[PDB]
Design a binder for this molecule. Structure first.
Ligand code: ATP
Ligand code: ATP
Ligand code: ATP
Ligand code: ATP
Ligand code: MG
Ligand code: MG
Lengths: 600, 592
RNA sequence: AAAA
């Protein structure tokens, strides 16, 4: 807690100590703006506050203006004062303001600034002597001559105070190229209120993260369709990834080599599989069969992560890639049974516990140093095998159910994945009774609909399995009833632009004329979420997946990207309170990044 | 308007120099000052006499001088606010300058201007500080006197009804003071998911004072605000509206055959109704509605009159969307060849005709959709559920119409045989046909029944269901699956009994449900039986659930919108209209 | 406590 005290004196320097001793409770620091006029005496303030080293103090000098004469001088001074105020809030709390010194215009400007950005209390100091000595204020306050007038209490706009990140890179705002950016901010607020009032039709609604305060130029830029040039804005955007397999993250290249390196014992590590030739990845120009695409990732996965060191390195690298992409929430699909090995007492449960422990350690160590971190949950993928061993699905479900009971931990199991061969041999109809247990235990269910997904199959998945999220399902608009049901039941679809681009084949690949249905789904209201599926085999992260929508779905707007992020948040398997916290954080970060992108 | 506003001090220059702030002449200027003898009005009066058109008004703050004391400052601030509101121009915002006066008075005037609106806040300055009016003429001729204006201010639209609630009070002292606005200002931050749950994103454009007032707890005195709100009703039985009073008389008098109408029997009255101080069983609750219903609505004319009166009451309550539950078989007789289908068609046609007529006249209209009630064990054999399900499925195919059947409702009386887990067999067709399922899983129902209705019957909404707090697993299942609960505060308060009704200590779980995240909605059940429309049903929350905020009421309305059985395309435009209306009413209801 |  720090009670920053703000004041400003014309030439009479007695006001600042008067304000300091107005409240005998004491404060933490005082910051005062003053002109560069020679009539002002900072030596008195320096020597008076030097007696209290425990309280910080500073003086900011407005160069180039001894006094306010014309409109230009006052405007530039107001810009400078707004900037200095912006650099001097408490990190979380509000400051205090006094208006006993200075000219009328500058005091009114300071009060306007306090109203705009908010303050704990706005007051003045009054005395019946107006003295000039310093060894008399103590006698005046002992007798009671000092009078303080408290009138102000104001929250301001949180969004209008969120722009403390716009000020720097301004070389001191010299006269030759001065930029009144806080003047642009006040034009922003005035314009927002004026379009809100004088207009009714165009000023109705549209913001999905409830921003509604960005400058109107920012809103117009958001409405315009994005291009491949918006990669800088997309990269800074806090994104959500919901479909990201753990075993298909580092399948080739330097990441694969360095995950092979820290693999505990390197004796059992062998150089198997190979990348695919003529495939101009990640922007392939030919369809790839699902089996061949899966085999492309065989370099890393079930046969490689069987040792603890390799698995730990893989998950650490995945978390590093996620945080490097500004992904603020992720849900990693992992198959613990694949990496289980009873030979070394490495069951599926201990593999899942290792993944959970390393993710929690990474998130906690990132939170301790106060840096960007990716809160990641896990999905126990209950894949279909049916090479015998029908108990495999039951074991996966039981492990997923019993893994929730950890209770604590920043990383936790949230749901299961119904992947596998989506053929009619393993439709969702048979498992209406297996999944009563998984539903009663609070787990969520996500399903795969990559191929041979008849609308009856998806109906069974969303009505018998009660899947709250679907995978791919690129042919929803073929069946209008299925699309209507998905719309009404508010279930989301995990659509991966690169995986669907390569596996199924969409425009502008030659000999393929099918259009990507992401834009049509968004218009229909489908809670679509752009994901990665496999960072390794697909070869691209979430930023590139969002960028490619400029080509797969022409005319897609940036506001639609914000809609996609909001839908990913809404369809995520998280509790209500955590969802609201995530929504607040995403709103704040979206506001900041939009302001930065529009200004630069 | 064209009104200037300024403060006075030692020098009288301030008003003459501010007079020519506009470059094309001004209309009328007013001055506020204290009782200090230093100020002379003679110079300003003489200077204004040269221009007889301008209205000169001088107001002296009685009994105050130099504003040196805390109480003196508070007195001056209160009188300044009263004078500012009394001198508030009717339509156009006024200009204001604050160069003169003490820093304290200047700050108070700036706060007043930024709180009640201002056409512009500006300043006057002169390098040489002139004294003789000849020096002002010289200054305007050779142009040193600049005009300093930090930027045009919007001001907050609604703070002017205070000038109506307070009289002139020419004679005043320290006895009279109104902390009406300072009470909301003090509690601005003096009081986690509140801000995150902010619905209707245009609420961010609201004034910070208005936003703070929105965060304040609900009170019984803001019925005027709660009435002007556009609300959504999702649980409103058609046959429980015109039960007693003039409504019953005018719905009976419009019957085609008044001879067969029984005008003798009337429902009993309970003291304190609708805020009954004693609990009542559900059977007697339905008994109150015996005046209307099946035995009355058989006649076509009276049924049409009932529908028209219900729509008129919905519009009068400023409800912008409703989902009326009707049981066509209850009002269908074969004596005059009146099947259930023709009854449903008559209700639908009356509703769509009313909506179209109101829309073509560009008035406020309530969009109405119908729910077909599939009652259990009412008329004997249980083929009625199948007949009603088929009726709903066929009636949803009509296509054309602003009013359409959107789903079915399942009705259970108390418990056990009235459980929502016996008829799971019929509902595959109704799910696949595009309809939505709602269950009356209320009035002390066990968690297993609600769970079965949620999962086996795929119900999208649950009626009442006040016992979710005792089943945390069920509560989590409801929360994560985004299944709304429609609770009627008045019906539950009258039947179940909660605080502050005497002899009962249980408290309504409305606030707890809102905090948990359940998409809870507030409805009317039966307007006639409960004797309470949606406005007062929402208002009674401030009494049943203390600490509920107005922003929580807005969240309740948003939840009602979200859980409605509407298409996404219609939902988007409904949300847009609701956001605009909410912003408009909030911007013109902080006025009190 | 720079046109108190
Ligand atoms: N698109 C998919 N469709 C069906 N099942 C999938 C899909 N992606 C992953 N899986 C499941 O995850 C595993 C994929 O292959 P594998 O068993 O070898 O482990 P992995 O590490 O996750 O991937 P990889 O094959 O690259 O090693 C299988 O269990 C598979 O059922
Ligand atoms: N990667 C993240 N970085 C920062 N905050 C996050 C992140 N992910 C989630 N959050 C949320 O932000 C808050 C973390 O910081 P904290 O709890 O101290 O509140 P805060 O500091 O006011 O918010 P912020 O960190 O955004 O400034 C939590 O509400 C958390 O849910
Ligand atoms: N609280 C309730 N519980 C169960 N069923 C209800 C409830 N309220 C209304 N109903 C249903 O409405 C009908 C009850 O009465 P009725 O059939 O005579 O016509 P009504 O207009 O809906 O109400 P009433 O005539 O009793 O005033 C039944 O279909 C019943 O299932
Ligand atoms: N009671 C209502 N009053 C006004 N508009 C409503 C009402 N209910 C719904 N609306 C919405 O207003 C629009 C109805 O009028 P219409 O479809 O012709 O467009 P509009 O005239 O441009 O909008 P508005 O009626 O608000 O001026 C729809 O978007 C509708 O969802
Ligand atoms: Mg996948
Ligand atoms: Mg009911």
């Amino acid at each position: 807690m720090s009670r920053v005290l703000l004041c400003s004196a014309g030439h009479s320097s007695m006001v600042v100590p008067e304000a300091f001793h107005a409240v005998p409770e004491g404060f933490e620091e005082v910051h005062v703006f003053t002109t560069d006029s020679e009539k002002f005496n900072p030596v008195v303030l320096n020597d008076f506050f030097h007696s209290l080293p425990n309280v910080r103090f500073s003086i900011t000098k407005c160069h180039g203006l001894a006094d306010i004469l014309n409109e230009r001088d006052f405007e530039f001074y107001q810009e400078m004062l707004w900037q200095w105020y912006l650099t001097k809030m408490p990190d979380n709390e509000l400051p205090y303001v006094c208006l006993s010194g200075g000219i009328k215009s500058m005091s009114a400007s300071l009060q306007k600034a306090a109203t705009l950005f908010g303050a704990q209390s706005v007051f003045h100091v009054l005395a019946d002597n107006n003295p000039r000595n310093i060894e008399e204020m103590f006698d005046a306050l002992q007798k009671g001559q000092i009078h303080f007038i408290e009138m102000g209490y104001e929250p301001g706009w949180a969004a209008l105070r969120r722009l403390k990140k716009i000020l720097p890179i301004n070389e001191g705002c010299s006269r030759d190229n001065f930029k009144p950016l806080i003047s642009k901010s006040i034009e922003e607020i005035l314009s927002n209120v004026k379009i809100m009032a004088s207009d009714t039709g165009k000023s109705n609604q549209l913001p999905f993260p409830s921003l509604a305060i960005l400058p109107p130029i920012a809103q117009q830029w958001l409405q315009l369709p994005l291009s491949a040039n918006d990669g800088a804005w997309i990269q800074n955007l806090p994104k959500v990834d919901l479909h990201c397999h753990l075993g298909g993250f580092a399948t080739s290249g330097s990441l694969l080599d360095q995950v092979r390196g820290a693999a505990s014992e390197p004796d059992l590590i062998d150089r198997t599989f190979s990348p695919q030739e003529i495939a101009g990845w990640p922007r392939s120009h030919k369809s790839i069969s699902l089996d061949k695409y899966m085999e492309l990732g065989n370099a890393n996965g079930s046969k490689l992560l069987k040792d603890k060191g390799c698995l730990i390195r893989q998950v650490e690298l995945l978390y590093q890639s996620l945080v490097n992409d500004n992904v603020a929430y992720a849900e990693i699909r992992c198959s613990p049974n694949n990496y289980a090995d009873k030979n070394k007492n490495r069951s599926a449960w201990v593999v899942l516990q290792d993944i959970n422990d390393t993710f929690t350690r990474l998130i906690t160590e990132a939170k301790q140093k106060n840096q960007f971190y990716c809160h990641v949950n896990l999905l126990v993928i209950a894949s279909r095998k049916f090479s015998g061993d029908l108990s495999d699905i039951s074991k996966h479900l039981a492990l997923a159910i019993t893994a929730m009971q950890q209770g604590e931990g920043v990383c936790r199991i949230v749901g299961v994945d119904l992947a596998g061969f989506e053929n009619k041999e393993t439709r969702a109809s048979y498992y209406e009774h297996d999944f009563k247990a998984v539903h009663r235990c609070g787990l969520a269910v996500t399903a795969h609909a990559g191929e041979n997904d008849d609308p009856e199959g998806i109906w069974q998945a969303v009505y018998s399995l009660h899947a709250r999220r679907l995978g791919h399902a690129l042919n929803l608009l073929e069946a209008p009833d299925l699309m209507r049901t998905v719309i009404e039941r508010k279930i989301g679809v995990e659509m991966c632009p690169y995986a669907n681009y390569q596996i199924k084949g969409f425009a502008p690949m030659p000999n393929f004329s099918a259009l990507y249905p992401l834009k049509k789904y968004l218009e229909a209201g489908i809670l679509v979420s752009v994901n990665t599926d496999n960072i390794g085999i697909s070869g691209a992260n979430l930023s590139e997946n969002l960028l490619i929508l400029a080509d797969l779905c022409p005319g897609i707007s940036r506001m639609d990207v914000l809609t996609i992020i909001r839908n990913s948040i809404e369809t995520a398997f998280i509790s209500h309170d955590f969802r609201m916290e995530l929504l607040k954080f995403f709103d704040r970060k979206i506001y900041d990044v939009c302001l930065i992108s529009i200004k630069n």
